[PDB]
Amino acid sequence: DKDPILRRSGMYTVAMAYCGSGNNKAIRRLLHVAVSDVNDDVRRAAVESLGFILFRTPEQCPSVVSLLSESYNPHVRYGAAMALGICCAGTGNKEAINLLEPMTNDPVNYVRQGALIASALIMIQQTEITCPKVNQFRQLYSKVINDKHDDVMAKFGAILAQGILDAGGHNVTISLQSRTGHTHMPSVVGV
Amino acid sequence: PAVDTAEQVYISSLALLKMLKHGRAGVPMEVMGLMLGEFVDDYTVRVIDVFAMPQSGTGVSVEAVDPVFQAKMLDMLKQTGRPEMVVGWYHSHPGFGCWLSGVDINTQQSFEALSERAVAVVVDPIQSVKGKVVIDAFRLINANHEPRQTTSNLGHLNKPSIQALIHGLNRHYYSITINYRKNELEQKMLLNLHKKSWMEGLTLQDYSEHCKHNESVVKEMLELAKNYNKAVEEEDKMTPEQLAIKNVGKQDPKRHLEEHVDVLMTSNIVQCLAAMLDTVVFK
Amino acid sequence: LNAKVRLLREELQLLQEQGSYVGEVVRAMDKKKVLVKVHPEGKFVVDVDKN
Amino acid sequence: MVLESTMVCVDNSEYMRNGDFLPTRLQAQQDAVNIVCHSKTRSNPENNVGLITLANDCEVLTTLTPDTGRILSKLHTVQPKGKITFCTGIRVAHLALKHRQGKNHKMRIIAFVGSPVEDNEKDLVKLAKRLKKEKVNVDIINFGEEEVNTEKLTAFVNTLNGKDGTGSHLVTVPPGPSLADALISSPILAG
Amino acid sequence: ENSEKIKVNKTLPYLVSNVIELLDVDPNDQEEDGANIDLDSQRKGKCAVIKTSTRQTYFLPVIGLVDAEKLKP
Amino acid sequence: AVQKVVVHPLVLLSVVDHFNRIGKVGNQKRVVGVLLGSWQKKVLDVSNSFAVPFDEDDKDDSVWFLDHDYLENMYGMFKKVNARERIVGWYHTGPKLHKNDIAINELMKRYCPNSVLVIIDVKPKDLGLPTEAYISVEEVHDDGTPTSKTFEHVTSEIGAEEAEEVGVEHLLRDIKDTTVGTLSQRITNQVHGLKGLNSKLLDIRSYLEKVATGKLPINHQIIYQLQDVFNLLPDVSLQEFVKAFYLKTNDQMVVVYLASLIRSVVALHNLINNKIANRDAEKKEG
Amino acid sequence: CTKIINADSEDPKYIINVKQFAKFVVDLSDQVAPTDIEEGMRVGVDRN
Amino acid sequence: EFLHAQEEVKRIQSIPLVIGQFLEAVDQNTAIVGSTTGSNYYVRILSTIDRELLKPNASVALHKHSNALV
Amino acid sequence: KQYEKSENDLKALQSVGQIVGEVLKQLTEEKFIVKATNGPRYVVGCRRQLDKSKLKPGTRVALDMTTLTIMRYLPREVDPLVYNMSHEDPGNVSYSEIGGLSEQIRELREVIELPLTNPELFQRVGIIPPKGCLLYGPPGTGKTLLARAVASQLDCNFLKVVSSSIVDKYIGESARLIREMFNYARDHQPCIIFMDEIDAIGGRRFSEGTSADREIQRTLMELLNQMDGFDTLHRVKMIMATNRPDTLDPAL
Amino acid sequence: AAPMSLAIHSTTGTRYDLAVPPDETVEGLRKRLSQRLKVPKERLALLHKDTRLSSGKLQEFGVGDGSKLTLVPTVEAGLMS
Ligand SMILES: Nc1ncnc2c1ncn2[C@@H]1O[C@H](COP(=O)(O)OP(=O)(O)O)[C@@H](O)[C@H]1O
């Protein structure tokens, strides 16, 4: 199609059709759109969809979004951040956080916002022992929100991230797939 | 009572070309004009077509000279199928960026009093380059708080420039996102401008000119290869920093050789393929 | 290639920063100041950065 | 007062050479349409009037305009020639008044016919039904008096205002020399 | 009100100048509407060129608030 | 005679906007207007346009209205805005030439005797330019006897000033592939030209079919032209021509061979430099 | 520092010549009375 | 995208510029350039410029504020 | 009339000046290098409706102040000094009042007046008319009177200067005055320059001397090379006047 | 009174319909429109039959009940003045 928004609907359809199957062809399509399209929102929607395909093998999302985070296009950066967020949900990977750290101080603001929300999604409920970097991230949220020299979008991101980190008391997690392994359709829809 | 930050002003292709051309015409002067369109929703303000206006002024100010033209032209355009009525005004700042001044603000304030959601569009012909066009749409903040309400990131994606801030952005006026949405036939003709006739595709070159061009470039490559030799012998007896200055004001053989090789090889391949393709097609 | 494009895309703001004068130092003196002739203007007693 | 856009249909066929009706019948029609146009201008300021000469085929000599000076100026230099074509004349006049400058105006026509018509009556009624379906009001003047009656002409004017349309007229004028303006009283002064 | 605006626009500080020449200039050719300037064209009388005391020469398309022929180089 | 006619992108886009607006208004299949511009000693220059209300009877091609009064008023207003531009011709958005065209042109011919007609299709199902230009001339026959007025095609192209170029290049961010190198000179042509030649030959073949099957009459100037066309086609089995073709292909090859040698040496040099840099970095690191 | 060159009209209006800067036509601030200033005497003026 | 960016940075080369001389290049991306006003400067060199044309004491056009060598 | 003057003044108040500078080269179709009089050189645009064929490398041009857009061309500048050199008033002496000079006035008219009406004679004999003549003689004889008569009676333009008023303090300004004067004459052909007391600057060029002496000698070299230098002078005539012809440079 | 009920169409589409006394002057209409719109009266310019209403009483210009009046504001741009 020529209308950009319908193309975005198409990327979302690819995302929801192949949810968790890791279908290499759907990945091929989304990445080709991510690097080749002319609109920026379609690029962002494409990078984001990758999260839905590859969430059963979180070891693979960083492998295909590390280079894409360090991208000239800010919307692609935000897409990589949120793709890591959905893909590695409730897992607390060292790698995901290693990618999400440097870019939480990205010059563009909405990139910082997406980075903070992605970190809050990944490192939900983890204590000091489980991940060494939880305390760093709580302190980062506090510093960002208190600061006044920083942008408003970043403050929004930090606030939502504080909300996410400790949700429903401290006794609820985000699992796209049920403990047996079935895809949890409400979780996909919600995220 | 919102004016959300997701509100956009839709400029058509024709309107953009008209603004840009009119502005470049009066390069030292603040030429100006009107824009016709519609008010669809609280998130869209569509600008369909524009029309220049009779005017006179100096390099420091410009003003209309007749309103008869405005009403008459509205009637004529309405006759042939463009009933839309005015939605704002545009003018050109030739080299000063895009912002609003005191006089600008005064005229825009009169327009806004006329209709609430009026916009001001500013173009900078000389600052616009081949690809990107320097342009922006504005509106006036009152003396009341926050001028507009936020329900998305659609407002905060542009990083307003230092000059626009200095001259009053986000203090007396606020910007609006500009969308260049286009229909199918516009898309189809914009792609059809740069297309040459079909005969040009299958025309060879004057072969004598071909050979002269080839021999000229090769006679250049001779000396470039000599200099390449004279230059590779260095790069060992040269300090790691000194090399970064070795190539300032002095030809470099490597890059020129790369360029000439690409030129020669492309040109010859294309000529050969055309010759063979013709050799087959026409009997 | 990505780095090259990013640098080119930023270069518009980097090229709008002011410049720096070229001065001929006359003699370092005092705590950390220097006396610098700024052709064509007169001399100054300027500060010296940390580096 | 009722905004009404008419289009006069002066004729300039070779049969105007005759003087049966004051010198050079064309002169009789000239004076008649001149007074008629003045009448229209006095009917309503926003009203307009036009001139579509019924020459060999046609030539709209002046499109709709509230001002009449152009109408009368173009009215001269109408040295007659050839033969008329009624169907083409009405069709062009209709196409022309479809494009009112003010679409609120009510479409209408007034005709000055003084020649023999060469066209089967069936197609005349066909053009009549079309004009009716498009809500058009003619007012035929059987000037010239080639038939001084129905020259395959009555059916057209009955159909157009058929079902007591009271919108179309056939004010036939006899060959007696006396400028029609005195004759025509209803279609012009008050329908 | 004219005199009040005039007086306010005559703030005391002036940048003294000497008139260098009093050119007589006329329009070259027709100027398209939409883009027309009253200085380059649309000027029939004389015009002045002045050298301010700051070693800067200026062209005054409208001479100012004094009759032209009084002034001399 | 006009050696060339140059239209400007603004005109094309304005005609497209016109057709969109009327079609949105509906009940039409063509649009008509004017064209403003100037002359440069037989190299025309069309630069701007505006509308002119018009309507036609599809069934019979002898009924039509064109409010020339609108044309005069708009010429007054435009000439007030831009003096340097005077009427140059007229345009219409029908796919292909209509029967009224000579009638309208003779109407238009009053405003500019040297009036050229420019058709701007707005739905290109082809690979070729979007405009066709036509100039009305008297044609005298050797047997066709009566002298009518027929349109003679004249070369046309698209041209733009720096402002228009900037704007279009800005809007053209929907697809873009420059690759000025061999990729362009092989997509813009070869394939494109062969496709166009095929389409033209197919049109000639359709007409020939129609004549042969009786659906049409025979035209003798067409037959003579086609005979000349078939007589032009060269023969590629002459020893002289084969000799010449091989000679020239050989020269072209020696040049490409030299080019490739140059490139190989440069790439090898780059590999060597990278290897030396890696070795030095390792030795320093060790 | 500026060197007055002329004192035109009874109304205070003073032509001063700032050395190597410019030459102006300025007026008297309130502190100085008109009698204090004569032609040819160095005077001090502000930077605005 | 690189060709695109190259064609987009060229707005820094707007028409009202200031002539100057290129005196000496101190590393790449910086050079001492002597303005026509008479004051030397330490400025930034635009990426696109072909360095083969920055011969010593070679005529050059500078930005009006940044004074970058354009 | 008061309100017309008032509105004229109020309209006049809103208008700005154009920097005057010289075009040095035309880079591309819309790029000109302009050297503003103060000295800073700019690359600037050009208004679209302006005969760009008249902006040769040297035309004077009026630049707008904000964008520096070329906006108008002007004829060469005429310094106020030269305006005064060219608007003197030699009373109304006629040739009658000059008594006792008949041969001399004939020679003078032969030199300056005849070639300005009757060049065909000089073409028939085959000679180029002479340029300038020195009037030397004891004080009070009639030199300046003759020059005033020549100025008033004759019809070509006149330029009158005292060589002791050319000289100026700043180095390289007197020479510029001489050069610009001769350029002005070269423009308004025909013209006559009457250098009065050329002994004020025409003095033997010594080997040994001081700074001011050297500066005046530079002025004199400029004059000498303007009279008969690389550029043929053509149709401007000269007359000098001295009571000390002896103290003059042999090259003059 | 016999108020003259006119129409004031703006070039934008909105319609500020108003009724005035018979003896109103173009200055008075301009002034009332300025109060309604909160814009200076100089910036306005009324139109009738493609003919500005420069000044003076409305009647002798011909402006009558059930008339069409276009209201057109001024358009100005410039660094200063
Ligand atoms: N031949 C003459 N006829 C009349 N007056 C003369 C004559 N010669 C000198 N004068 C007088 O001398 C004055 C002119 O001086 P002039 O001879 O022109 O200059 P210079 O001082 O170089 O001799 C006049 O007042 C004039 O009356």
CA distance B91 to chain F (A): 15
C-alpha distances out from residue J15 to D102, E49, I171, Å: 19, 52, 74
**B104: helix, coil or strand?**
helix
How big is chain G by its Cα radius of gyration, in Å? 10
Strands of C43-46's sheet, edge to edge?
Answer: C24-29, C33-37, C43-46
The CA distance from F100 to F94, in Å, is 12
Long-range contacts at I169-175 (CB < 8 A, ≥ 24 apart): I171/I215, I172/I218, I174/I201, I174/I215, I174/I216, I174/I219, I175/I218, I175/I219, I175/I222
Cα dihedral sign, F234-F240-F241-F242: positive
Ligand 1: centre distance to CA I95 (Å): 13
What's phi and psi for F31, nearest 5 deg? Answer: -135, 150
Which residues, in sequence order, are bridge partners of residue F56?
F64
Which of B115, B42, B122, B62 lies closest to B85, judged by CA?
A: B115
The CA distance from H1 to F177, in Å, is 10
C-alpha distances out from residue B257 to D68, F42, F160, F266, G10, Å: 78, 43, 34, 9, 81
Residue type, F99: K
Q: Which region holds residue B79: left if phi is over 0, alpha if psi is between -120 and 50, else beta?
A: alpha
Strand D8-9 to D110-112 pairing: parallel
Q: Please work out, in degrees rounded to the nearest 5, the angle formed at the alpha carbon of residue F209 by the alpha carbons of F203 and F214.
A: 135
Does the beta carbon of I144 sit less than 6 angstroms from any atom of ligand 1? yes
Does the beta carbon of I142 sit less than 6 angstroms from any atom of ligand 1? yes
CA distance H38 to chain B (A): 23
Q: Please identify among residues 131-150 of chain A the ones whose CB lies closer than 8 Å to any CB of chain B.
A: none
J57 contacts: CB under 8 Å, gap ≥ 6: J23, J24, J25, J26
E strand spans, chain B: 8-11, 32-40, 44-52, 55-58, 61-64, 85-92, 119-123, 135-140, 173-179
Domain with D162, as residue range(s), is 3-186
Decide: I183 and I82 in contact? Cβ < 8 Å.
Answer: no
- CB count within 10 Å of CB B216 equals 10
| Contact exists between J and H (3 or more beta carbon pairs < 8 Å) | no
E60 contacts: CB under 8 Å, gap ≥ 6: E47, E48, E49, E50, I15, I17
- Cβ of I125 under 8 Å from any chain E Cβ? no
Ligand 1: centre distance to CA I148 (Å): 10
C41 contacts: CB under 8 Å, gap ≥ 6: H39
Decide: H24 and H55 in contact? Cβ < 8 Å.
Answer: no
The CA distance from B167 to I168, in Å, is 48
Cα dihedral sign, E13-E19-E25-E30: negative
Experimental method: cryo-EM
C-alpha distances out from residue I56 to B266, E17, I23, I61, Å: 41, 29, 7, 11
Does the beta carbon of I139 sit less than 6 angstroms from any atom of ligand 1? yes
- Cβ of C2 under 8 Å from any chain A Cβ? yes
Cα dihedral sign, I163-I165-I170-I172: negative
The CA distance from B185 to C49, in Å, is 62
Residue D169 is inside which H or E element, if any?
strand D169-172
Cα dihedral sign, E19-E20-E23-E29: negative
Give the burial class of I145: count Cβ atoms within 10 A of its Cβ; 0-12 exposed, 13-18 middle, 19 or more buried. Answer: middle
D32 contacts: CB under 8 Å, gap ≥ 6: D112, D141, D143, D179, D180, D181, D184
The CA distance from G33 to G14, in Å, is 13
Q: Which residues of G30-45 are buried (b: 16+ CB within 10 A; e: fewer)?
A: eeeeeeeeeeeeebeb
The CA distance from I92 to I112, in Å, is 19
Decide: E20 and E14 in contact? Cβ < 8 Å.
Answer: no
Strand F131-139 to F116-120 pairing: antiparallel
Strands of G14-18's sheet, edge to edge?
Answer: G22-26, G14-18, G2-7, G42-43
Residue listed under structure tokens 């390449």: B228
Which of H53, H59, H49, H43 lies closest to H10, judged by CA?
A: H49
What's phi and psi for A134, nearest 5 deg? Answer: -65, -45
CB contact under 8 A, H42 and C21: yes
Give the total number of structural domains in chain D.
Answer: 1
Q: Which pair of structure tokens corresponds to residue F227?
A: 């005979």
Q: Which residues of B touch D101 (CB under 8 A)?
A: 75, 79
| Contact exists between F and B (3 or more beta carbon pairs < 8 Å) | yes
DSSP B144: -
E strand spans, chain E: 17-24, 46-52, 56-60
Give the alpha-carbon dihedral of D36, D41, D42, D43, to 10 degrees. Answer: 90
Q: Which residues of A touch B157 (CB under 8 A)?
A: 110
- Which residues of B touch chain A, with CB atoms under 8 Å apart? 153, 156-157, 159, 184, 187
The CA distance from B63 to F277, in Å, is 66
CA distance I98 to chain E (A): 34
Discontinuities in chain C with C to N beyond 2.5 Å fall right after: none
Q: Please work out, in degrees rounded to the nearest 5, the angle formed at the alpha carbon of residue F235 by the alpha carbons of F232 and F236.
A: 140
Q: Which residues of G touch E14 (CB under 8 A)?
A: 24-25
Residue type, A5: I
The CA distance from D116 to D119, in Å, is 10
The CA distance from I198 to I183, in Å, is 19
| Contact exists between C and F (3 or more beta carbon pairs < 8 Å) | no
C-alpha distances out from residue D40 to D6, D97, D187, J66, Å: 9, 16, 11, 20
The CA distance from I141 to I100, in Å, is 9
The CA distance from D15 to D9, in Å, is 15
Residue to mutate, I97, I101, I103, I145, ligand 1, most ligand atoms under 8 Å from C-beta: I145
Q: Which residues of A touch F173 (CB under 8 A)?
A: 38
Q: Which pair of structure tokens corresponds to residue F208?
A: 């020939």
Ligand 1: centre distance to CA H66 (Å): 67
The CA distance from I230 to I219, in Å, is 17
B118 contacts: CB under 8 Å, gap ≥ 6: B87, B88, B108, B111, B112, B139, J12
Q: Which residues of D51-83 are buried (b: 16+ CB within 10 A; e: fewer)?
A: bbbbbeebebbbbbebebeebeebbeebebeee
Q: What is the DSSP string of chain I?
A: -HHHHHHHHHHHHS---EEEEEEEEE-STT-EEEEETTS-EEEE-B-SSS-TTS--TT-EEEE-SSS--EEEEEPPP--HHHHHHTS---TT--TTTS-S-SHHHHHHHHHHTGGGT-HHHHHHHT-PPP-EE--B-STTSSHHHHHHHHHHHS-SEEEEEEHHHH--SSTTSHHHHHHHHHHHHHHSSSEEEEEETGGGT-----SS--HHHHHHHHHHHHHHHHHSSSS---SEEEE--BS-SSSS-TT-
Q: Please work out, in degrees rounded to the nearest 5, the angle formed at the alpha carbon of residue D90 by the alpha carbons of D87 and D92.
A: 105
Which residues, in sequence order, are bridge partners of residue B61?
B58
Decide: D132 and D101 in contact? Cβ < 8 Å.
Answer: no
Does the beta carbon of I100 sit less than 6 angstroms from any atom of ligand 1? yes
The answer as to whether D169 is a domain residue is yes
CB contact under 8 A, H52 and B252: yes
DSSP F23: H
Quick check: bond before J73 cis, omega within 30? no
The domains of chain B are located at 8-191, 202-276
- Cβ of J7 under 8 Å from any chain B Cβ? no
Q: Which pair of structure tokens corresponds to residue F224?
A: 């003579």
C-alpha distances out from residue F54 to A157, F51, F62, F63, Å: 59, 9, 14, 11
Q: Which pair of structure tokens corresponds to residue I41?
A: 């050189």
Decide: D106 and D137 in contact? Cβ < 8 Å.
Answer: yes
Does the beta carbon of I143 sit less than 6 angstroms from any atom of ligand 1? yes
Q: Please identify among residues 203-232 of chain B the ones whose CB lies closer than 8 Å to any CB of chain J.
A: none
Q: Which pair of structure tokens corresponds to residue E24?
A: 């007589």
Residue A142 is inside which H or E element, if any?
helix A134-146
How big is chain H by its Cα radius of gyration, in Å? 12
Q: Which residues of F81-94 are buried (b: 16+ CB within 10 A; e: fewer)?
A: bbeebebbbbbbbb
Q: Which residues of B touch D99 (CB under 8 A)?
A: 79
The CA distance from D39 to D32, in Å, is 10
DSSP B197: P
Ligand 1: centre distance to CA I153 (Å): 17
Decide: F21 and B81 in contact? Cβ < 8 Å.
Answer: yes
How big is chain F by its Cα radius of gyration, in Å? 27
Which residues, in sequence order, are bridge partners of residue I52?
none
Which of I74, B268, F189 lies closest to E25, judged by CA?
A: I74
- CB count within 10 Å of CB E36 equals 22
**B98: helix, coil or strand?**
coil
The CA distance from I17 to E49, in Å, is 9
- Cβ of A3 under 8 Å from any chain F Cβ? no
Q: What is the DSSP string of H35-63?
A: ETTS-EEEEEB-TTS-GGG--TTEEEEE-
The answer as to whether D191 is a domain residue is no
Q: Which atom of ligand 1 is nearest to the CA of I140?
A: 23
- Cβ of A66 under 8 Å from any chain C Cβ? no
Give the alpha-carbon dihedral of B159, B160, B161, B163, to 10 degrees. Answer: -160
Q: Which pair of structure tokens corresponds to residue B200?
A: 């040009």
C-alpha distances out from residue I173 to E49, I167, I170, Å: 21, 8, 6
A96 contacts: CB under 8 Å, gap ≥ 6: A58, A61, A62, A84, A88, A118, A122
Resolution of this model in Å is 2.9
| Closest chain B CA to residue A107 | B159
- Cβ of A71 under 8 Å from any chain C Cβ? yes
Q: Which region holds residue I5: left if phi is over 0, alpha if psi is between -120 and 50, else beta?
A: alpha
Strands of J7-10's sheet, edge to edge?
Answer: J7-10, J68-71, J46-48, J51-52
E strand spans, B94-171: 119-123, 135-140
Q: What would you measure as the largest C-alpha separation in chain B, in angstroms?
A: 81
The answer as to whether D148 is a domain residue is yes
Q: Which pair of structure tokens corresponds to residue D176?
A: 């007696």
Closest CA to ligand 1's atom 10 = I142
Residue J77 is inside which H or E element, if any?
strand J76-77
**F217: helix, coil or strand?**
coil
Strand I236-239 to I132-133 pairing: parallel
The CA distance from H35 to H61, in Å, is 9
Ligand 1: centre distance to CA I139 (Å): 8
The domains of chain F are located at 2-182, 223-282
**B111: helix, coil or strand?**
helix
- CB count within 10 Å of CB F72 equals 10
Q: Which region holds residue B227: left if phi is over 0, alpha if psi is between -120 and 50, else beta?
A: alpha
What ranges in chain F are assigned the alpha helix state H? 9-25, 68-81, 101-108, 162-171, 184-186, 192-212, 220-232, 239-285
Per-residue H/E/C for chain G? CEEEEEECCCCCCEEEEECCCEEEEECCCCCCCHHHCCCCCEECCCCC
Q: Which pair of structure tokens corresponds to residue H14?
A: 């707007």
H68 contacts: CB under 8 Å, gap ≥ 6: C15, C16, C19, H12, H43, H44, H45, H46, H62
The CA distance from D71 to D59, in Å, is 13
- Cβ of E30 under 8 Å from any chain B Cβ? no
The CA distance from I178 to C33, in Å, is 51
D27 contacts: CB under 8 Å, gap ≥ 6: none
Size of interface B-F (CB pairs under 8 A): 221
Ligand 1: centre distance to CA I143 (Å): 7
The answer as to whether D7 is a domain residue is yes
Which of A42, A99, A108, A95 lies closest to A68, judged by CA?
A: A99
Q: Which of H13, H18, H19, H35 to mutate to test the interface with I (most CBs of I within 10 A)?
A: H19
What ranges in J6-64 are assigned the alpha helix state H? 26-37, 58-61
Cα dihedral sign, F91-F93-F96-F99: negative
**A172: helix, coil or strand?**
coil
Residue type, E37: I
The CA distance from I174 to I154, in Å, is 29
Ligand 1: centre distance to CA I86 (Å): 22
Which of E28, E49, E46 lies closest to E37, judged by CA?
A: E28
The CA distance from F268 to B281, in Å, is 41
C-alpha distances out from residue B194 to B130, F7, F157, Å: 15, 12, 10
Neighbours of chain A (3+ CB pairs under 8 A): B, C, F
- CB count within 10 Å of CB F3 equals 10
Which of H66, H64, H70 lies closest to H36, judged by CA?
A: H64
